[PDB]
């Protein structure tokens, strides 16, 4: 016959390989494919949908809806309200639609969108600093040090929300989904620009946050997600 | 299969990484070394 | 002729006894193009204020001196507004014009290897598995006087290797000519010039954590006075950043 | 393929511009050929350096690692740091971009599973570990008799090349856990092994072939035996036992001769 | 003015207006400066360039 | 590898006249470099004797 | 004495009354002289070679 | 420039401090043409194996040394395959490239006359009518150290004249410039090159019996050390036969 | 593959040494022997 050869990997079964296999049930006619609303051809379209960051995850508030909102009040001096260390493996991002698509992939590139919405009455007002400390920098712990990075200032009224874009700033072309000091992504922190002023002295306000991927976001090296674990058999 | 008194360069797995050694060689010059001068 | 003049803005080198300039890998420093870019933010080009000659401290070259090295960008971290741009940015790139200067007399004999090593990863001074410390690989402008091979070199604190024959990395001196280099032979020339582009597999990285290049001056043949009472000669190093870029403005990474 | 140039004829020459003079100081190699020095004949020279190009030179599929199945389980973190002969050949260069095809040579029998565990997650730590059940971790099932498993890993950089040498750190100045060299710069994954039978021997040899290589900045070849991996440390501590404590050997390949000029 | 076997490198710096007289060669090299090798040509020239806030400088 | 069948010969250095320094006891140092010409060619890639591993790297 | 030190790369020459053989470089790529160089340590990966050698002496 | 390179096959002279080459009588060596030929047999041209530089023994030049001479083809009679072709042939011709080499220092003073004399017929060392012996006019590569004029020079055995002022033939030195010559002035040049064609009134003659040329090196001004302890300097002579021919192959005329 | 009422000469390993026997025969003559004469 025709001379052939069987190089290494010929009789292999690779779980990720792409091959054609014999059809059992030949002649079988599948049921017709109708139109269904919602067709999704890529899972990065789920990461580009906003989803709430559990910004309040702490000892008491995890397990409750209150883990999604922070309290803001009027203060005499600027404070650091919130810190969102940028890691897709951190519970803050890892539990979102963005972060839980990215936890199936070993590393990523592209820009993040974080949107802050304040839930207060209509007579409350405020200015906030939202800063992004680029990779390699120290978490600021002062508003003078925070404003030296990528930052926005959002006035509060008449529109609920504002969006800081976390732009892609990286030495290398990809960032590891799991936090390390080599590829680390930096920090997003929330500050008072002026103050949160309610209509009454003790008044308060709530801030939510959502994250989505920008269109330039890309992932690679599909892996198991740490976001599922099976300790028992399902019967 | 992937691509093309004859020859045939055929990729069985349809990936550029899955190919064998790259035997097509053009780029070269020693002068980056041995003569690394302005003038 | 042997004359040379190199003007990088605000500053001028004039070398009257000179070789050709080594252009490392036949490559001049360029700004990072858009094809090769990673980060989306518009970088800053300081140009004439950062790109200019920074002369470091001179080192005394003596009988029995084993050599010196400087790390780049490190050596320039305190130098002018170039060093300021290192601390206030995530990332940066640059090429360098290294001008090494040693003059003696027609009665002096000696030879120096002046080489630039990309990614010169040192070796620990000896023994067990220890990363050489950040403190020792970042001496700043002062560089590192190579001391020498001894069983008595202090192994504490993650110190780098002192042996110039093995290039401190475990590879023979004398093969160091594979890197951009010139020899200063006191018989021939009193100086050297190497123009190195930006070398890295990354478009820009952190100027403080990573040392792209290393400037290494090894006394290939010792310094003979001849008949003169001059047993030592200075060696001055002058670095010009060229086509330096910085991006990711932040708080200074200083203390 | 590129053949070496032919030798051209040359006669006696009286020239006021010597080609045999020069300056070693300029930093350039000699341009001299035998036509400058002696009187030569035309030689038609068909020799090639094809076997010296970086594809052929680094393209032979060396052994990177060995593991032993302990309780029908093994683990290996992919790297070339462990084997001196292939580590020396990669380190002629500062930067390498290559795909690698991984062949597994095992003396076991029955049935084996290899799991490629991408960075950033937890691997199976034993056989029968539930993590051997994976949706998205690529694995290979093979029977060692009748064939050797082989797969290609493309180039996973985070950068445009792999660092063979890295003069930086992964953390800032004051951090006490700083790591020096290429270990933080990339991680190529790890290979987990288990046997689903008992059968044959426990030895697993991992052979890796760089392919599609691009090499960048030539370096002096390693002049000294390696001591630790991810180091460049060449000082070798032979014994911890006693008065020879803190005595180090360089272990180089230079050999002496009795006399210069008598060789 | 020396003999023909003497040699030297010198830094000639110009500290621009508004600056402090350096008192260190690290501080002097941060201004306009030249470096003149000494041999085979007698002289070297630093140009003190015009650097001024206003258009004229008082004598 | 050196053998008597293919052996390559010898390069030796001699005084043509003399090395004369400016002072009687004066001395001089000679270095030497080697490179391949462009016609140099190699074949049959093998292991280099210039590396040896007696220990495991851990 | 000189192996392990930088002085292994240079030889001493003085004035002598009669010609002497200063140095011998037996031509083998396996000899330490050549085997440790860039030339010789590329050639030690290959079983045999052809072509011309360039040796440059600097004093 | 002062640089020069002369490559005669298998061998290369390199002179970095040099004058123009003297081409004797404006004539390069040629092979004997058919118009001028005598013998009917086809001559042999050894070319690269005979035509190449043969360096002789060096002579120590000192205070008070009167000079040296070499006879050609004689000096080459034991040298390589050129000297072999002298013994196995009746006749032969050749031109020569004589390269004389003396280097000292910028503290040394001295001058040498390097001349090539066609048919330099010596004079007997003194007294009665005696042919100078074959043994003395054929020293080989060693040449003859000229000793000097004395009443005490041994007159035995047909010895040649020792007085360099009279050129050993009875004609004044200082008129020796009528022959192809150069001066080596230590202030100026360290070497000399003379290309002499084949000079004779005969197309070829016996290489052993007749000495066509003579190379004569006379210390025109003595050797002053200056301030150095070097009172002597070597003088090396290097001869290349060029366009050498041989005819009349026979048994070697050797013993 | 390497090269070419038909026939196909195909080299699977793309080396001239890796081919089988060389069956294409032209050169011959006994006269180098049996008649090795000037005239």
Swiss-Prot record, chain D:
Subcellular locations according to the entry: Virion; Host cytoplasm
Record note on quaternary structure: Interacts with capsid protein VP0, and capsid protein VP3 to form heterotrimeric protomers. Five protomers subsequently associate to form pentamers which serve as building blocks for the capsid. Interacts with capsid protein VP2, capsid protein VP3 and capsid protein VP4 following cleavage of capsid protein VP0. Interacts (via C-terminus) with capsid protein VP4 (via C-terminus). Interacts with host CDHR3 (via N-terminus); this interaction occurs near each threefold vertex of the capsid and allows the virus attachment and entry into the host cell.
Function: Forms an icosahedral capsid of pseudo T=3 symmetry with capsid proteins VP2 and VP3. The capsid is 300 Angstroms in diameter, composed of 60 copies of each capsid protein and enclosing the viral positive strand RNA genome. Capsid protein VP1 mainly forms the vertices of the capsid. The VP1 C-termini form 60 dominant spike-like protrusions on the surface of the virion. Capsid protein VP1 interacts with host cell receptor CDHR3 to provide virion attachment to target host cells. This attachment induces virion internalization. Tyrosine kinases are probably involved in the entry process.
Protein known as: Capsid protein VP1
Record lineage: Viruses, Riboviria, Orthornavirae, Pisuviricota, Pisoniviricetes
Curated annotation (Swiss-Prot), chain F:
Protein name as annotated: Capsid protein VP3
Chain's role: Forms an icosahedral capsid of pseudo T=3 symmetry with capsid proteins VP2 and VP3. The capsid is 300 Angstroms in diameter, composed of 60 copies of each capsid protein and enclosing the viral positive strand RNA genome.
Subunit organization: Interacts with capsid protein VP0 and capsid protein VP1 to form heterotrimeric protomers. Five protomers subsequently associate to form pentamers which serve as building blocks for the capsid. Interacts with capsid protein VP4 in the mature capsid. Interacts with protein 2C; this interaction may be important for virion morphogenesis. Interacts with host CDHR3 (via N-terminus); this interaction occurs near each threefold vertex of the capsid and allows the virus attachment and entry into the host cell.
Signal peptide residues on this chain, from the entry's feature table: none
Chain ranges passing through the membrane: none
Species assigned in the record: Human rhinovirus C (strain C15) (HRV-C15)
Location of this chain's protein in the cell: Virion; Host cytoplasm
Superkingdom assignment: Viruses
Location of this fragment in the whole protein: 510 to 567 of 2153
């Amino acid at each position: 016959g025709l001379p052939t050869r069987l190089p290494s990997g010929s009789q292999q079964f690779m779980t990720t390989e792409d091959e054609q296999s014999p059809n059992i049930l030949p002649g079988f006619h599948p049921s017709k494919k109708i139109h269904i609303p919602g067709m999704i051809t890529n899972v990065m379209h789920m990461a580009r949908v906003d989803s709430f960051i559990p910004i309040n995850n702490i000892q008491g508030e995890v397990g409750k809806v209150s883990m999604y909102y922070i309290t803001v009040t009027k203060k005499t001096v600027t404070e650091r309200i919130l810190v969102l260390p940028l890691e897709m493996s951190n519970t803050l991002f890892a539990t979102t639609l963005l972060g839980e698509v990215l936890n199936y992939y070993a590393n990523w590139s592209g820009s993040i969108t974080i949107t802050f919405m304040c839930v207060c009455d209509a007579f409350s007002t405020g200015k906030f600093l939202v800063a992004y400390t680029p990779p390699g920098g120290k978490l600021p712990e002062d508003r003078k040090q925070a404003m030296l990075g990528v930052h926005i200032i959002w006035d509060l009224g008449l529109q609920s929300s504002c969006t800081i874009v976390v732009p892609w700033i990286s030495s290398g072309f990809y960032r590891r989904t799991k936090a390390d000091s080599f590829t680390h992504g930096g920090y997003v922190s929330l500050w008072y620009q002026t103050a949160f002023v309610p209509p009454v002295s003790g008044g308060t306000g709530s801030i939510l946050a959502t994250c989505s991927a920008c269109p330039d976001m890309s992932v690679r090296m599909l892996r198991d997600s740490p976001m599922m674990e099976q300790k028992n058999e399902l019967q | 299969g992937a691509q093309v008194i004859k020859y045939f360069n055929i990729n069985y797995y349809k990936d550029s990484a899955s190919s064998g050694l790259s035997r097509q060689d053009f780029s070269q010059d020693p002068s980056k070394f041995t003569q690394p001068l302005v003038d | 002729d042997r004359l040379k003049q190199i003007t990088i803005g605000n500053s001028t080198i004039t070398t009257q006894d000179s070789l050709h300039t080594v252009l490392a890998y036949g490559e001049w420093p360029t700004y990072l193009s858009d094809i090769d870019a990673t980060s989306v933010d518009k970088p800053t080009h300081p140009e004439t204020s950062a790109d200019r000659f920074y002369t470091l401290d001179s080192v005394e070259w003596q009988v029995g001196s084993h050599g010196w090295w400087w790390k780049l960008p490190d050596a320039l971290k305190d130098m002018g507004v170039f060093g300021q741009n290192m601390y206030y940015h995530s990332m940066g790139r640059s090429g360098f014009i290294i001008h090494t200067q040693c003059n003696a007399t027609k009665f002096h004999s000696g030879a120096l290897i002046v080489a630039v090593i990309p990614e010169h990863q040192l070796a620990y001074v000896g023994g067990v598995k220890v990363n050489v410390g950040y403190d020792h690989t970042h001496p700043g402008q002062s560089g590192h006087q190579i001391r020498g091979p001894s069983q008595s070199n202090d192994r504490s604190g993650g110190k780098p290797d002192e042996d110039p024959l093995f290039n401190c990395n475990g590879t023979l001196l004398g093969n160091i000519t594979i890197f951009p280099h010139q020899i200063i032979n006191l018989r021939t020339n009193n100086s050297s010039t190497i123009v190195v582009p930006y070398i890295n597999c990354v478009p820009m990285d952190n100027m403080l954590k990573h040392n792209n290049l290393s400037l290494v001056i090894i006394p290939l043949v010792p310094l003979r006075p001849g008949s003169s009472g001059i047993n030592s000669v200075p060696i001055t190093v002058t670095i010009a950043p060229y086509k330096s870029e910085f991006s990711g403005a932040m708080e200074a990474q200083r203390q | 393929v590129l053949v070496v140039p032919d030798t051209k004829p040359s006669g006696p020459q009286h020239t006021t511009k010597p080609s045999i003079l020069g300056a070693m100081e300029i930093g350039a190699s000699s341009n001299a050929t035998p036509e400058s020095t002696i009187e030569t004949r035309y030689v038609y020279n068909t020799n090639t350096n094809a076997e010296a190009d970086v594809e052929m030179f680094l393209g032979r599929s060396a052994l990177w690692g060995k593991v032993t199945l302990t309780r029908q389980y093994a683990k290996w973190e992919i790297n070339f740091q462990e084997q001196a002969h292939i580590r020396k050949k990669f380190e002629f260069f500062t930067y390498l971009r290559f795909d690698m095809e991984v062949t597994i040579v095992t003396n076991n029998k029955g049935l084996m599973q290899i799991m490629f565990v991408p960075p950033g997650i937890d691997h199976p730590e034993t056989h029968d570990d539930r993590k051997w059940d994976s949706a998205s971790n690529p694995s290979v099932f093979f029977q060692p008799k009748s064939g050797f498993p082989r797969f290609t890993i493309p180039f996973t950089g985070l950068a445009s090349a792999y660092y063979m040498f890295y003069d930086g750190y992964d953390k800032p100045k004051g951090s006490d856990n700083n790591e020096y060299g290429i270990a933080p710069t990339n991680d190529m994954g790890l290979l987990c092994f288990r046997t689903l039978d008992n059968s044959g021997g426990n030895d697993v040899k991992i052979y890796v072939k760089p392919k599609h290589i691009t090499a960048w900045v030539p370096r002096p070849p390693r002049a000294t035996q390696y001591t630790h991996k991810y180091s460049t440390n060449y000082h070798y501590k032979p014994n911890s036992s006693g008065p020879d404590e803190h005595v180090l050997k360089d272990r180089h390949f230079i050999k002496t001769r009795p006399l210069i000029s008598s060789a």
